[PDB]
From a paper:
Triosephosphate isomerase (TPI; EC 5.3.1.1) is a glycolytic enzyme which catalyses a critical step in glycolysis in which a toxic triose dihydroxyacetone phosphate (DHAP; produced by aldolase in the previous step) is reversibly converted to d-glyceraldehyde-3-phosphate (GAP; Rieder & Rose, 1959). The TPI, in most species, is a homodimer with the substrate-binding site located close to the dimer interface.
The asymmetric unit contains two FhTPI dimers. The main secondary structures of the FhTPI monomer are a single β-sheet (an eight-stranded barrel) and 15 α-helices, which are arranged in a α/β barrel motif. There are 27 hydrogen bonds and seven salt bridges at the dimer interface that stabilize it. Out of these interactions, of especial interest is the interaction of Lys50 and Asp51 that participate in hydrogen-bond and salt-bridge formation at the dimer interface. In our studies, both the ‘targeted’ and ‘blind’ docking approaches identified TCBZ binding poses in a region within the dimer interface, distant from the catalytic residues.
Author numbering:
A (entry chain BBB): 2 to 253
B (entry chain AAA): 3 to 253
The structure:
Amino acid sequence: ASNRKFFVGGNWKMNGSKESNQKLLKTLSDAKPDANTEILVAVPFVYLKDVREHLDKRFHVAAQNCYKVASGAFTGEISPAMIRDCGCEWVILGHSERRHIFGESDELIGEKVNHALTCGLKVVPCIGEKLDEREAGKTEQVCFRQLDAIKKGIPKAEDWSRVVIAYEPVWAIGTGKTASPEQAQEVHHAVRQWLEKNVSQAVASSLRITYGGSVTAANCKELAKKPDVDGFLVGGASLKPEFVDICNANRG
Amino acid sequence: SNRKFFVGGNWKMNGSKESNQKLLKTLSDAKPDANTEILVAVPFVYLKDVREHLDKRFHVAAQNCYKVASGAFTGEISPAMIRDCGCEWVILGHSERRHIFGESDELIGEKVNHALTCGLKVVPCIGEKLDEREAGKTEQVCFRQLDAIKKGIPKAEDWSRVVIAYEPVWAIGTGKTASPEQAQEVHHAVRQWLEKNVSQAVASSLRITYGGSVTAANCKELAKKPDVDGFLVGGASLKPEFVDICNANRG
Ligand SMILES: [Cl-]
Ligand SMILES: [Cl-]
Ligand SMILES: [Cl-]
Ligand SMILES: [Cl-]
Ligand SMILES: [Cl-]
Ligand code: NA
Ligand code: NA
Ligand code: NA
Ligand code: NA
Ligand code: NA
Ligand code: NA
Ligand code: NA
Ligand code: NA
Ligand code: NA
Ligand code: NA
């Protein structure tokens, strides 16, 4: 086999306050979840510095987005340099909400991946297909196009060491469709085969491919057991006490 | 004029703990014109720290926000989060958000609605591009953008918490420099629009600020224009000359 460290990210999205953040982080920290699992929280920009100062170094802190240059005339945007200046080392890039609500292109995501890695951050690039794409038989076509753009952005092959991929079944998020652990495993296996052919066997065997569909305390252990599922990028559940149980998904 | 002069400095995507400390110490120590309202619009990651550092004499603004309090909008910041950082202002509809990030008139109106509902004060930005100005569409474009902002105002009293910024996008990064006369012409047209579409009371009280190229050399001549009630400054906001621009309405 290959032994990839399990990775659980909690994407708070546009949620949090000084008061609610303190309560969530105390619960997570006091619970001491599975020591063998890497744990990340992706928090709103306005709380990045305070969350990183409060939270023990065991836990990673990510920004939920960044732009593709260090500074300039981009009112409202945040750079990797500003994320590092807040003491944080991670960023989520190409999240389905950024792609499909805010219209971020594959090429823009590739340029953000390039700039973040150049500045020394670690990145969680997100991929995934919509319902119309899946129904038209374009799951691999869409995912491979998105992966091509991320690969083009990797400055040097060694930098894959700082990448965690998240697959989002957008076709299942906010449609009546539900993705099964079997459907998750099928896509993750296809992504790993893509990495083997287009990057290297060494990168394919070491890279964490995490699942960004609906993850609950009730389904997390069955997903974790799948051989090509190396963890999660959790949405709504990341704000809830069940995030601790999801962090323990790979424990036994 | 009985409209209080208003000078905003938009840092855009610029700042660090170190550079911010130097800029804010210089601004604070300079004690610029106490009769002028001064705002700094800073990157989200520094909002809380800038508001804690700066005396209440200064306003601190976010550079953007979204149109609901919470939800599944990875990367977005709400008015509730801006208030939670101790800040009371937000810039909305900046030319960069409209023309680089594709924010629609309708979205800007919804953001204005949500920010005002949550108790923030707002700086909605309007302005026409070069192709629009050359086609004689300056007023058509500005009035379309103002219609969408007005649709977002929850109740007429809420204009008390609005400062409009006119950005001559046609002049920003086309190499062209807009004259104080060209600024005054647009500001007068916007004030007449407010008189007809809102009220004479709002038209006479609302600050219409200029967001074109403002320098130490042109700021006093712009300030003296009867319908120019201050500035939304870009690059100069990071420089010592921002203090001179804050003093534009003196003498
Ligand atoms: Cl970190
Ligand atoms: Cl490669
Ligand atoms: Cl404030
Ligand atoms: Cl009104
Ligand atoms: Cl009237
Ligand atoms: Na790695
Ligand atoms: Na669903
Ligand atoms: Na493989
Ligand atoms: Na299941
Ligand atoms: Na697994
Ligand atoms: Na303060
Ligand atoms: Na009223
Ligand atoms: Na009023
Ligand atoms: Na210019
Ligand atoms: Na004036």
